[PDB]
Copies of this chain bind each other. A is one copy, B any other.
Amino acid sequence: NTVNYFKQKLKTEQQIGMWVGLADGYCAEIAANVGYDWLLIDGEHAPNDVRSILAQLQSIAAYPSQAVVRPVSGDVPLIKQLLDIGAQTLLIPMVESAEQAELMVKATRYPPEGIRGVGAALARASRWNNISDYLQTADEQICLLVQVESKKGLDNLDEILNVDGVDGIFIGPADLSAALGYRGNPGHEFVQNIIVQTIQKIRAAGKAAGILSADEKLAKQYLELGTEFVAVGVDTSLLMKSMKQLLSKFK
């Protein structure tokens, strides 16, 4: 019902993901019909706000695909809002220290242990108190993933990996390749060797490892490493690419 199946499957299987940046309920529903294990509603790099993410959670809710929401940043009030509209799995960009990851764990948990604002009567998260024990049980079905995607993030990796309540570390190859001076070129061996080592350290610390690659060969290679959550394409890239390919057959 509101069991976080993406959260349970981190320990259980490898989950194939689709990036959703078309930023509307109608597009999110089309993606939701395909059968991806997870759909990333991108609040960071697509023109989304709280209301458009809600619309996309409502579309996707009818379908087995599990929703993961990336906020624009690790903003504690915005995390409060996204949890209340019922986003059960968050991906926080650009996480750079154990202290920042601990703030994000606290942002996802109610007082007295955390700092998640309490407003269950008003929340789709509680179905407006129609889930009777929401305030006692919400935490069990919240999944927190953080992105390592900067030099400082790699510099604090072991420390982030010992933070209790971080379920998964996701590697951002676009941000990380740029930070490493290989902007636009994550396929470089220098970047790939750091990514592979990063995945191994994530899985050796008992956390789930995730990544995005539209490159089919790199995606399969990440899956052979045991990477637990692999996004394998992007709705905007697939729409543009297929329309271009179709046109080139007639130019």
Contact of A179 among B112, B216, B220 (CB under 8 A): B112
A72-B80, A184-B136 known; A216 vs B249 contact (CB < 8 Å) = yes
Q: A residues 200-249 with Cβ under 8 Å of B?
A: 214, 216, 219-220, 223, 230, 232-244, 246-247, 249
Contact of A25 among B18, B44, B55 (CB under 8 A): B55
Question: With the chains together, A75 CA to B175 CA distance in Å?
Answer: 19
Q: Which residues of chain B have C-beta atoms less than 8 A from A178's C-beta?
A: 110-112, 118, 135
Q: Which residues of chain B have C-beta atoms less than 8 A from A219's C-beta?
A: 250
A30-B239, A129-B237, A240-B129 known; A42 vs B247 contact (CB < 8 Å) = no
Q: Which residues of chain B have C-beta atoms less than 8 A from A251's C-beta?
A: 16
Indicate if the CB atoms of A62 and B58 lie closer than 8 Å: yes
A156 at the interface (CB under 8 A from B): no
A187 at the interface (CB under 8 A from B): no
A166 at the interface (CB under 8 A from B): no
Contact of A234 among B61, B122, B127 (CB under 8 A): B122
Contact of A52 among B45, B51, B220, B235 (CB under 8 A): B51
Interfacial residues, chain A to chain B (CB-CB below 8 A) = 16, 18-19, 21-27, 29-31, 33-36, 42, 44-52, 54-55, 58-59, 61-62, 72-73, 75-78, 80-81, 84-85, 93-94, 110-112, 117-124, 127-130, 135-136, 150, 172, 174-175, 178-181, 183-184, 214, 216, 219-220, 223, 230, 232-244, 246-247, 249-251
